[PDB]
Design a protein around this nucleic acid. Structure first.
Ligand SMILES: [K+]
Ligand SMILES: [K+]
Ligand SMILES: [K+]
Ligand SMILES: [K+]
Ligand SMILES: [K+]
Ligand SMILES: [K+]
Ligand SMILES: [K+]
Ligand SMILES: [Mg+2]
Ligand SMILES: [Mg+2]
Ligand SMILES: [Mg+2]
Ligand SMILES: [Mg+2]
Ligand SMILES: [Mg+2]
Ligand SMILES: [Mg+2]
Ligand SMILES: [Mg+2]
Ligand SMILES: [Mg+2]
Ligand SMILES: [Mg+2]
Ligand SMILES: [Mg+2]
Ligand SMILES: [Mg+2]
Ligand SMILES: [Mg+2]
Ligand SMILES: [Mg+2]
Ligand SMILES: [Mg+2]
Ligand SMILES: [Mg+2]
Ligand SMILES: [Mg+2]
Ligand SMILES: [Mg+2]
Ligand SMILES: [Mg+2]
Ligand SMILES: [Mg+2]
Ligand SMILES: [Mg+2]
Ligand SMILES: [Mg+2]
Ligand SMILES: [Mg+2]
Ligand SMILES: [Mg+2]
Ligand SMILES: [Mg+2]
Ligand SMILES: [Mg+2]
Ligand SMILES: [Mg+2]
Ligand SMILES: [Mg+2]
Ligand SMILES: [Mg+2]
Ligand SMILES: [Mg+2]
Ligand SMILES: [Mg+2]
Ligand SMILES: [Mg+2]
Ligand SMILES: [Mg+2]
Ligand SMILES: [Mg+2]
Ligand SMILES: [Mg+2]
Lengths: 88, 73, 119, 101
RNA sequence: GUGGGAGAGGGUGGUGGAAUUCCCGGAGUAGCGGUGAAAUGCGCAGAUACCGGGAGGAACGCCGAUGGCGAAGGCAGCCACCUGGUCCACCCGUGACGCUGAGGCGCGAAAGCGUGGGGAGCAAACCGGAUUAGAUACCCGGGUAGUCCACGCCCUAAACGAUGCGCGCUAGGUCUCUGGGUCUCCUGGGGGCCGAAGCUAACGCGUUAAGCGCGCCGCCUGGGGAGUACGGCCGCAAGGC
């Protein structure tokens, strides 16, 4: 699973300022964590569909958030993608 | 039917999650090794749901019977 | 020729017939009887009276081996189960205990169409 | 690291040499799979509700341990290697849930 | 975000006991089985009934509910691992990031297809026995595919609450599952029943709307011809759209 220390590690990494748990950066980073781990889980367990729905939902969410970011401040968006290594 | 008396009412204060404890768990089974319904056990939904798991565990461990022979029929 | 004198009596009762097997305390058969053992042929084997005749027959043949007292094990649910028990009690054999051992699975095998709406 | 409880049912017919040998093997397995033993209750010979491997009785060992999760199942498998081990059940430990309190 | 909760939600591996069939041995004898009644069938190469030992496949009694979980199909012995969704409390962070959704992509009971494996019980087809005027069926005895596993297809359904999704608004009472709190009660999230206003052709629905409203999608336009003809798309085929 995702331990608390890992999650704080990622949150304090992307925070816009001290104590920011809610910014689009933090949300997208967290989502990327979960998505990656879930995909890793789904490389094996190819027959687990009910989780895969979860994955679709997470990807959808992350994409909407990122669309919001690029609409608002394209700089922070570029920066986020350069950081997380999103797209492809 | 199944109204006689209250399996929960007469008993001490016990851990419902303890599979190793036998002598308490025995009272939740009938003459046959069957798990008494709520009518008898008197427990609540959650309590019953936990009791089931516990009893089944103790069964696998060999501390409790899966089935028993009915006597004086 | 044995001279056992202490034994077990298995009453196997279906709706089609009743079979009574009397054995030594280790479970090895001594004598046995059934509805068909007596004069009965058709559905009359399932009859309570036929069960009585069977039980009594097994008991007589048992007392021929010097049998005295038995432990009754009842398997199956059908007519003439309780009648077979009754006959055994009245047979002169002392019945120490009666037990129901009737086999039941825990959803094991698919029953045939007649027995369905179950598992 | 997570806290579990290991239930071991052994063969009651064993003498002290064989029993203590089984104990040694069990604890060497526990250490080799990285489990730290917190508390241990040995009940020993007790009458089973149904015969296990034709024996009416069984020897009962209980180990509350802390071990890495990824290896847990493997540990159990190892514990089941010997013939003298009749049952092995590893349970994720839980807080007591009472009644009539 | 933090701290907690319940659950047959999913996937992988392991493991448990009951029963059925089969095999081996003991003991034992004239039948067993089956039906409305029977017969076919099985049994002197010793069956049925009983004890012991073994092999194997499949499904999980009680708990079990009027219960729970899932988006649907659907999910039930136990254990561990991996993993989805969801609820509550705190009122901490972001600052409209929302809703719906033609195409697209994925999932999708059973039966069915392909390759291989497995095969205890059940069992289309089929073979027999009966029943009947006849019995191609219903009842009985057999029995192959199949049912089971892996991988790949198939895309259907009374796939139903025959009720598209989201948000706001409009008396209550009662039972229940699951949270939290100043715990007789209060306040959330589910599942039922009776019912205000109201609606409905009626039946009934009624804070789990079928009431009052707004947004977006799908669909309907008398019956038969006909889910047919033609064309196209998909499918190995059956066939589907
Ligand atoms: K979770
Ligand atoms: K074919
Ligand atoms: K429809
Ligand atoms: K409470
Ligand atoms: K009606
Ligand atoms: K066509
Ligand atoms: K074609
Ligand atoms: Mg957790
Ligand atoms: Mg038994
Ligand atoms: Mg008969
Ligand atoms: Mg309490
Ligand atoms: Mg589950
Ligand atoms: Mg399994
Ligand atoms: Mg068995
Ligand atoms: Mg034999
Ligand atoms: Mg002869
Ligand atoms: Mg075989
Ligand atoms: Mg979870
Ligand atoms: Mg705030
Ligand atoms: Mg601000
Ligand atoms: Mg949508
Ligand atoms: Mg399908
Ligand atoms: Mg299928
Ligand atoms: Mg096939
Ligand atoms: Mg095949
Ligand atoms: Mg083959
Ligand atoms: Mg058959
Ligand atoms: Mg047939
Ligand atoms: Mg064919
Ligand atoms: Mg249709
Ligand atoms: Mg329906
Ligand atoms: Mg409610
Ligand atoms: Mg009215
Ligand atoms: Mg109403
Ligand atoms: Mg239409
Ligand atoms: Mg159209
Ligand atoms: Mg027309
Ligand atoms: Mg017309
Ligand atoms: Mg039409
Ligand atoms: Mg139509
Ligand atoms: Mg149609």
């Amino acid at each position: 699973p995702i331990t608390k220390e890992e999650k704080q590690k990622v949150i304090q990494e992307f925070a816009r300022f001290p104590g920011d748990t809610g910014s689009t950066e933090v949300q997208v980073a967290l989502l990327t964590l979960r998505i990656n781990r879930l995909s890793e889980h789904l490389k094996v367990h190819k027959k687990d569909h009910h989780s895969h729905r979860g994955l679709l939902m997470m990807v959808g969410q992350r994409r909407r958030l990122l669309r919001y970011l690029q609409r608002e401040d394209p700089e922070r968006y570029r920066a986020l993608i350069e950081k997380l290594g999103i797209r492809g | 039917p199944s109204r006689k008396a209250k399996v929960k009412a007469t008993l001490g204060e016990f851990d419902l999650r303890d599979y190793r404890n036998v002598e308490v768990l025995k009272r939740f089974l009938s003459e046959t090794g069957k798990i008494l319904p709520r009518r008898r056990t008197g427990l609540s939904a959650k309590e019953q749901r936990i009791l089931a798991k516990t009893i089944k565990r103790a069964r696998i461990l060999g501390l409790l019977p899966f089935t028993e022979k009915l006597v004086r029929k | 020729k044995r001279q056992v004198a202490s034994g077990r009596a298995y009453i196997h009762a279906s709706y089609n017939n009743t079979i009574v097997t009397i054995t030594d305390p280790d479970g090895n058969p001594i004598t046995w009887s059934s509805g068909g053992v007596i004069g009965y042929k058709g559905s009359r084997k399932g009859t309570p009276y036929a069960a009585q005749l069977a039980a009594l027959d097994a008991a007589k043949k048992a007392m021929a081996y010097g049998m005295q007292s038995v432990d009754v094990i009842v398997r199956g649910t059908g007519a003439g189960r309780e009648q077979a028990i009754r006959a055994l009690q009245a047979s002169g054999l002392q019945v120490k205990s009666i037990v129901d051992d009737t086999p039941v699975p825990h959803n094991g095998c698919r029953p045939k169409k007649k027995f369905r709406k179950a598992s | 690291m997570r806290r579990y409880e290991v239930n071991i049912v052994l063969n009651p017919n064993l003498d002290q040499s064989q029993l203590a040998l089984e104990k040694e093997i069990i604890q060497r397995a526990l250490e080799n799979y990285g489990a730290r033993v917190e508390k241990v209750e040995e009940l020993g010979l007790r009458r089973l509700a149904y015969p296990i491997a034709k024996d009416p009785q069984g020897y009962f060992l209980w180990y509350q341990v802390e071990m890495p999760e990824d290896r847990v199942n493997d540990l159990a498998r190892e514990l089941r290697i010997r013939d003298n081990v009749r049952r092995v059940m590893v349970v994720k430990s839980q807080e007591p849930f009472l009644a009539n309190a």
